[PDB]
Amino acid sequence: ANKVIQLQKIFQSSTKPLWWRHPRSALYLYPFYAIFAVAVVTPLLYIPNAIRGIKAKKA
Amino acid sequence: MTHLERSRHQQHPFHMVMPSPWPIVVSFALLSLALSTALTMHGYIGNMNMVYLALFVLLTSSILWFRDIVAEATYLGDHTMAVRKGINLGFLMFVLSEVLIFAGLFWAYFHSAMSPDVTLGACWPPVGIEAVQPTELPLLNTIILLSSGATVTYSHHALIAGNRNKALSGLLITFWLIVIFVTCQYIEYTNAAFTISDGVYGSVFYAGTGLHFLHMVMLAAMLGVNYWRMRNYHLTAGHHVGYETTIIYTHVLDVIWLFLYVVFYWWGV
Amino acid sequence: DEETFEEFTARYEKEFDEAYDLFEVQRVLNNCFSYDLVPAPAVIEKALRAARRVNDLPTAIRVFEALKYKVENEDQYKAYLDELKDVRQELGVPLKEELFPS
Amino acid sequence: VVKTAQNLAEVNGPETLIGPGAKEGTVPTDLDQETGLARLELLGKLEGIDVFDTKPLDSSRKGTMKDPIIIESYDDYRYVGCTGSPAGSHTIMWLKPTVNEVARCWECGSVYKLNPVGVP
Amino acid sequence: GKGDVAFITKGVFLGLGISFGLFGLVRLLANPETPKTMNREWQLKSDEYLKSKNANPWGGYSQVQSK
Amino acid sequence: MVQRWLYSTNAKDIAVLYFMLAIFSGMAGTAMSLIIRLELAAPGSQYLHGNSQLFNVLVVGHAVLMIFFLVMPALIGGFGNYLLPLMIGATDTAFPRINNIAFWVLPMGLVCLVTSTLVESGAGTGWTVYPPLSSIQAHSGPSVDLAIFALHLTSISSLLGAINFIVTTLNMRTNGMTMHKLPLFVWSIFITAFLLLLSLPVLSAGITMLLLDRNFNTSFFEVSGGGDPILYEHLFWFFGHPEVYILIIPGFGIISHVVSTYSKKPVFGEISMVYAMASIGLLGFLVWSHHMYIVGLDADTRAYFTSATMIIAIPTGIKIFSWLATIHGGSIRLATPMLYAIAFLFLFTMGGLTGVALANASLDVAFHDTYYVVGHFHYVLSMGAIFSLFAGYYYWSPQILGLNYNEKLAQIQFWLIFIGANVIFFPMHFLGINGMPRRIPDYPDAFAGWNYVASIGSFIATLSLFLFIYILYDQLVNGLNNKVNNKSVIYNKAPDFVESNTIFNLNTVKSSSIEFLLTSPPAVHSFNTPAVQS
Amino acid sequence: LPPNALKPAFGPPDKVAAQKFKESLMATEKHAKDTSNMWVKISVWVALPAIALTAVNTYFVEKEHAEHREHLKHVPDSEWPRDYEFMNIRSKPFFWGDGDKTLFWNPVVNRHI
Amino acid sequence: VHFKDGVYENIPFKVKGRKTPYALSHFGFFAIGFAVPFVACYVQLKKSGAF
Numbered sequence A: 001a002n003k004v005i006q007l008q009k010i011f012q013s014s015t016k017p018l019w020w021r022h023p024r025s026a027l028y029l030y031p032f033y034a035i036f037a038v039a040v041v042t043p044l045l046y047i048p049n050a051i052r053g054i055k056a057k058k059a
Numbered sequence B: 001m002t003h004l005e006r007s008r009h010q011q012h013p014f015h016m017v018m019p020s021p022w023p024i025v026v027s028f029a030l031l032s033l034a035l036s037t038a039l040t041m042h043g044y045i046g047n048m049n050m051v052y053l054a055l056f057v058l059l060t061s062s063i064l065w066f067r068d069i070v071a072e073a074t075y076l077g078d079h080t081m082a083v084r085k086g087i088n089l090g091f092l093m094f095v096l097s098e099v100l101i102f103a104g105l106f107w108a109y110f111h112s113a114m115s116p117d118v119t120l121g122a123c124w125p126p127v128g129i130e131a132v133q134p135t136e137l138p139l140l141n142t143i144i145l146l147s148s149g150a151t152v153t154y155s156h157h158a159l160i161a162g163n164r165n166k167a168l169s170g171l172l173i174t175f176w177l178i179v180i181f182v183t184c185q186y187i188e189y190t191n192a193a194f195t196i197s198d199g200v201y202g203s204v205f206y207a208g209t210g211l212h213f214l215h216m217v218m219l220a221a222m223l224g225v226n227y228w229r230m231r232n233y234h235l236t237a238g239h240h241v242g243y244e245t246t247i248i249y250t251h252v253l254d255v256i257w258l259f260l261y262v263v264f265y266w267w268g269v
Numbered sequence C: 001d002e003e004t005f006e007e008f009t010a011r012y013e014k015e016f017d018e019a020y021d022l023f024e025v026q027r028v029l030n031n032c033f034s035y036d037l038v039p040a041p042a043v044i045e046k047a048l049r050a051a052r053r054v055n056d057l058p059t060a061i062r063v064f065e066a067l068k069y070k071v072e073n074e075d076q077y078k079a080y081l082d083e084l085k086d087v088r089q090e091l092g093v094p095l096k097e098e099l100f101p102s
Numbered sequence D: 001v002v003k004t005a006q007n008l009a010e011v012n013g014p015e016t017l018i019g020p021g022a023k024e025g026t027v028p029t030d031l032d033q034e035t036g037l038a039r040l041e042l043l044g045k046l047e048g049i050d051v052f053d054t055k056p057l058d059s060s061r062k063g064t065m066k067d068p069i070i071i072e073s074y075d076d077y078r079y080v081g082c083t084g085s086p087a088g089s090h091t092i093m094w095l096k097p098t099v100n101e102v103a104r105c106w107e108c109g110s111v112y113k114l115n116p117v118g119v120p
Numbered sequence E: 001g002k003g004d005v006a007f008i009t010k011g012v013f014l015g016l017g018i019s020f021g022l023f024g025l026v027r028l029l030a031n032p033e034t035p036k037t038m039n040r041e042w043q044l045k046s047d048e049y050l051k052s053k054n055a056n057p058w059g060g061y062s063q064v065q066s067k
Numbered sequence F: 001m002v003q004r005w006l007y008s009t010n011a012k013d014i015a016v017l018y019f020m021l022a023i024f025s026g027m028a029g030t031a032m033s034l035i036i037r038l039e040l041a042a043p044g045s046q047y048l049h050g051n052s053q054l055f056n057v058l059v060v061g062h063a064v065l066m067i068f069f070l071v072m073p074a075l076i077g078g079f080g081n082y083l084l085p086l087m088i089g090a091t092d093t094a095f096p097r098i099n100n101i102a103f104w105v106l107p108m109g110l111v112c113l114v115t116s117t118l119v120e121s122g123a124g125t126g127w128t129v130y131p132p133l134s135s136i137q138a139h140s141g142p143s144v145d146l147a148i149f150a151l152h153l154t155s156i157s158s159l160l161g162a163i164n165f166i167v168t169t170l171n172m173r174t175n176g177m178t179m180h181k182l183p184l185f186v187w188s189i190f191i192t193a194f195l196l197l198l199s200l201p202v203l204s205a206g207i208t209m210l211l212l213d214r215n216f217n218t219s220f221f222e223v224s225g226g227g228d229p230i231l232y233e234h235l236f237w238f239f240g241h242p243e244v245y246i247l248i249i250p251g252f253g254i255i256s257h258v259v260s261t262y263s264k265k266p267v268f269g270e271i272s273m274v275y276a277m278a279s280i281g282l283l284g285f286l287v288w289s290h291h292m293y294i295v296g297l298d299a300d301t302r303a304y305f306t307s308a309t310m311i312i313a314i315p316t317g318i319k320i321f322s323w324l325a326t327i328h329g330g331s332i333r334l335a336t337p338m339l340y341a342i343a344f345l346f347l348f349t350m351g352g353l354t355g356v357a358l359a360n361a362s363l364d365v366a367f368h369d370t371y372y373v374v375g376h377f378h379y380v381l382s383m384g385a386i387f388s389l390f391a392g393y394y395y396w397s398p399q400i401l402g403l404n405y406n407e408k409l410a411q412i413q414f415w416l417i418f419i420g421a422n423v424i425f426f427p428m429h430f431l432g433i434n435g436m437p438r439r440i441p442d443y444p445d446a447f448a449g450w451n452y453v454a455s456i457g458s459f460i461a462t463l464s465l466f467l468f469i470y471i472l473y474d475q476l477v478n479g480l481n482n483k484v485n486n487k488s489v490i491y492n493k494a495p496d497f498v499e500s501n502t503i504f505n506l507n508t509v510k511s512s513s514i515e516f517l518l519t520s521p522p523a524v525h526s527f528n529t530p531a532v533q534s
Numbered sequence G: 001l002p003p004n005a006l007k008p009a010f011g012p013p014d015k016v017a018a019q020k021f022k023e024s025l026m027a028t029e030k031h032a033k034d035t036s037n038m039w040v041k042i043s044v045w046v047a048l049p050a051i052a053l054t055a056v057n058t059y060f061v062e063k064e065h066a067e068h069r070e071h072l073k074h075v076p077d078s079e080w081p082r083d084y085e086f087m088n089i090r091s092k093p094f095f096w097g098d099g100d101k102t103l104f105w106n107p108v109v110n111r112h113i
Numbered sequence H: 001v002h003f004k005d006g007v008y009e010n011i012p013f014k015v016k017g018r019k020t021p022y023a024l025s026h027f028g029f030f031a032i033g034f035a036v037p038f039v040a041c042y043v044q045l046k047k048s049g050a051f
């Protein structure tokens, strides 16, 4: 609803990093770090079974 | 302006970007995607939850990168004329790279079709394969693409002409026509006789038009974000470069769909 | 350059006459010995007088070291030393071989 | 408390380059919703004043130590590439006058003095 | 300057000697048993066959390279 | 510390991350080549207990690491991202987050290549991963998939960096620099980026086709199903010859800088060098089937391809004759980059002459998949591109690091690698002309004689690499003292013959590019005000 | 306090390349209005009398192909034509689902026996 | 961000003021790279029963 001047006055007069300057940034950024932290380390846990040759249980 | 006050600005028109986490985040997401798909393709991981999580993380990290680009371009005023020219040139080199991917796929189709094998029967399309006829639904798919370009052209020129309702409505018509095309391609893929496993014909056909399908679903996404930014007054009458890149993208997907049409549906039947 | 030899000498005579300090006379001497010709005796004489005007003595020795490196023979060098002898003894510069005898 | 700097002489830092919004039913033109360096460049082009100097080097004459070729700089140094008293007459000699040293070319021998117009 | 050509000659010959010596010391870690064909008797008995089959007439056919 | 190096957005930091990864992966590839060459030293199983699959996996790792993880991120990734903004006067590259992701997708390609080695048996297929060997029948398991993903992430990096380079030198040149007044290294990175942009798509298409063939039951190159592996050979080598010209063109730029600054005279006919590089890049797309002379083409196909492969000897000959002309009449200052450049000018021409021996399809039936081809390309790779890479390091390292190297140790290192590389790669022509095939872990006993001397030379080459590691250590620790004592060359140009030692002191550097005028180690904000040029 | 901080950094403001900038600024508006007018004219005179003629063509084929699938639903798999050698390549089973079914596997038009 | 200038501030690793010797970091950076194919060789020979 044309908040662009009001958002310019926040994004320019701010100290926080650019991905944190919006008021709603804590709603995006805090779940994403948890989802990212499991998404990058769960294949690394399956790397040793793939080296040993152990397939997962499907039946 | 005085020397004292000119010294409080940049002296050169180029964007010195602040340090950002999304390069290394997208890199680790591509790592997790590669390591997840290479282990679910061979059964070392039970289900597709890791691949789903990796693709979701990849998409959301790209979205946060694009959010920061929107923030730089709109709320900090960092995109000058030279930066605009550079972004347009980078998008043109990008679409040249993708046209070359399609040229490799057309090379694959032509190498299979110019003189076919003996295991298909010196025949094209091969024996038993019920080819998609070019008259029924792909003709409507060419029509709703040549018309989608005509809609986005007046939407663009009405964005320049000061009109707001005539540009938003044209963008909305363009977006809905693109998703009409995507659902018609889904209907063709369901009601198609051959599958992707049905030999080299199904391979090259679904490779070419499925890459076009993926480019069209990303086109629908960027038409949606252009509608959002035009309704919320981000796009202006003289400075709309993401919109311009989307227009270039529509008009190259149009001509490569035409080449896919006349090659995969007319010459190859 | 489609330059004749005479245009070279008339260019570098007036080029040496307009050098005004030690940077300029050494620079002009460098880019006149950086050609595929030994300079004529007249422009070497103008170079000696130019190094006299700036009051630097080892450049007027390095002129003769440069044309020793630049000529093809040692008799061309001795021909330069014959009729450049008067200006050399008038300015009073020594050649490097008689200054540092081996 | 601040306002919007109609022309270039009213620019006072970056809090003056904000803009008024569009109304509600109009597409914004860029005098409404541009900020920052893009608004500075837009203001300059509206006045005709090209900010961001892109003029090439003065190669009309040969700088002496009596009259150098004065190079304006917003810091204490500037890299300058000499190629001759016409446009290109030798292989480019890249130089760097500071505030305390002129630069002499050594191929053509032109001399570049620097004047610092900026603030330290 | 003043005897560094000699330094970077001695260093090259020292590097060659060190490389030869370490190559020998890690050839001492290889398989203890070379193949049976790499002795003189086997290679004479292969040149027997090659002379019987007229092999490599204008060049040479002889296979002996070991002791 | 995390924002400067993890969240990085300046090109001069991403360049040194590229360089660290490049020299790490070059140590990896050199270790792999040492294992290959140690197994090849004598007939029979020597060090790997039989197990020719492990040999093939090591050959794959050696080729992929040395090409896509040493030479490309060294030359393009390090030197282009560092020097092209500094030599066009740009403050940074255009698109810097792209420039950061184009580095950070390379450790991820490295870890997926290493676990490609560690899963079931590794992908022993050659670096040209040909089906049907690279298929799912002949290579069961996730090895080849992970190798294909390594190639995907490296192609993502080298495509994003290519877009970045093209735009940043078409758009961010400083305010006197027309396109004709560019340095030759910038033209090198420019033409290389176009070759990357035009060639990496077809490779990505071909190996994605292979990946879908392996895992998604589709049949692009499956014969029982309608495929053809010659389609893979075409789609691969349409990238594969532009790839090897990509590997060499920044080397041409580095040599044209080094030769001119150590001959103290400019390059003979610079714009003809630009035209020659552009002609090599254009003609490199027209020659791709000289790797396919045996597969069964027509005679007119092979006649055209001998003609087109032959007529690229003209611009490379123009470049090499121009290098000889720009050292003729000079004042040669025999420093380590000059030694590397002269060694380039000899050994690259020997590799190119064996290349024009290979260009004749009439004759390539005698040399295809032999060690003669291995001799040709290891000449023009490990003596063209590696020698120009060493020349670029010894040419730019004290400027962009602030620390000088030991000069005597550098010349010892040069002479050791110049001896050792010749001793490896010169007998390979003898082996290949006598009929020794490629990619074999064991050979007939008649090939033992030159194989032994080649693996003796391998130890000389890796000894000079270890010496180079020590040279890096001595530069990083004692690099401030090497300026004080006489262990290093401080000025790469001596005074001219009439230039005083005091008149030299006001004009210490005489360069035709901005790189040697900057502050040593250059500032985080170089070019606050823009540089200016007539 | 520098002495030269308060002098102007640009000098004379140019008056014809500002006017030419502003006339192009206000002339691409008028040409964009006329361009939008003729393009909505094209998009409603040509593009919707194209969808209007192809929707009535595709409703007929959406009838007569759905009815062909309707009568094909009554033909069991021993009355199915035997697949050629290249049809339904099975190198390894697909990693999702039940094996042989692909991503858009409509079981009416596709059958693997 | 404004970053530090100087001689040792352009490298991601620490050289001068360290509680450990630098040659540790330097030569263990390269010995790991020289030792990846030996780890590769060891695991693909233990998988093939040669050890």
Ligand code: HEA
Residues within 6 Å of the ligand: F022, F023, F025, F026, F027, F030, F033, F034, F036, F037, F040, F059, F060, F062, F063, F066, F067, F070, F071, F074, F125, F126, F127, F128, F374, F378, F381, F382, F386, F389, F390, F393, F421, F424, F438, F439, F440, F458, F461, F462, F464, F465
């Ligand atoms: C980048 C290209 C490159 C380089 C440098 C090398 C270097 C070497 N290579 Fe090879 N090689 C290939 C590319 C290269 N190779 C390719 C493409 C194949 C084909 C694979 C296939 O057939 O599928 C191959 C295959 C191949 C074969 C054929 C074997 C076969 O067919 O199976 C052999 C033979 O022994 C070999 C050995 C060597 C040896 C002993 C070196 C030695 O020269 C190593 C000595 C080199 C150095 C010591 C370089 C310095 C090291 C650095 C890290 C530079 C650092 C400097 C800076 C960072 C500034 N490699």
Ligand code: HEA
Residues within 6 Å of the ligand: F128, F244, F245, F247, F248, F290, F291, F309, F310, F312, F313, F314, F316, F317, F318, F320, F348, F349, F350, F351, F352, F353, F354, F355, F356, F358, F359, F360, F364, F367, F368, F369, F373, F376, F377, F380, F381, F384, F385
């Ligand atoms: C550094 C990268 C590089 C460069 C620059 C070259 C340069 C050339 N190469 Fe090479 N080549 C490779 C990398 C490179 N190559 C690789 C990696 C392979 C093997 C791939 C694989 O199988 O795995 C290969 C293999 C290869 C083949 C395939 C053979 C086979 O696989 O069976 C051919 C065929 O024509 C070829 C020819 C040439 C020619 C004609 C040049 C020319 O560009 C050389 C031009 C230079 C000169 C000609 C010398 C200088 C000129 C003069 C002194 C002028 C006077 C000379 C004449 C008039 C002749 N090389």
Ligand SMILES: [Ca+2]
Residues within 6 Å of the ligand: F039, F040, F041, F042, F043, F044, F045, F046, F441, F442, F443
């Ligand atoms: Ca062996």
Ligand SMILES: [Cu+2]
Residues within 6 Å of the ligand: F240, F241, F244, F290, F291
């Ligand atoms: Cu080639």
Ligand SMILES: [Zn+2]
Residues within 6 Å of the ligand: D082, D083, D084, D090, D093, D105, D106, D107, D108, D109, D110
């Ligand atoms: Zn000059």
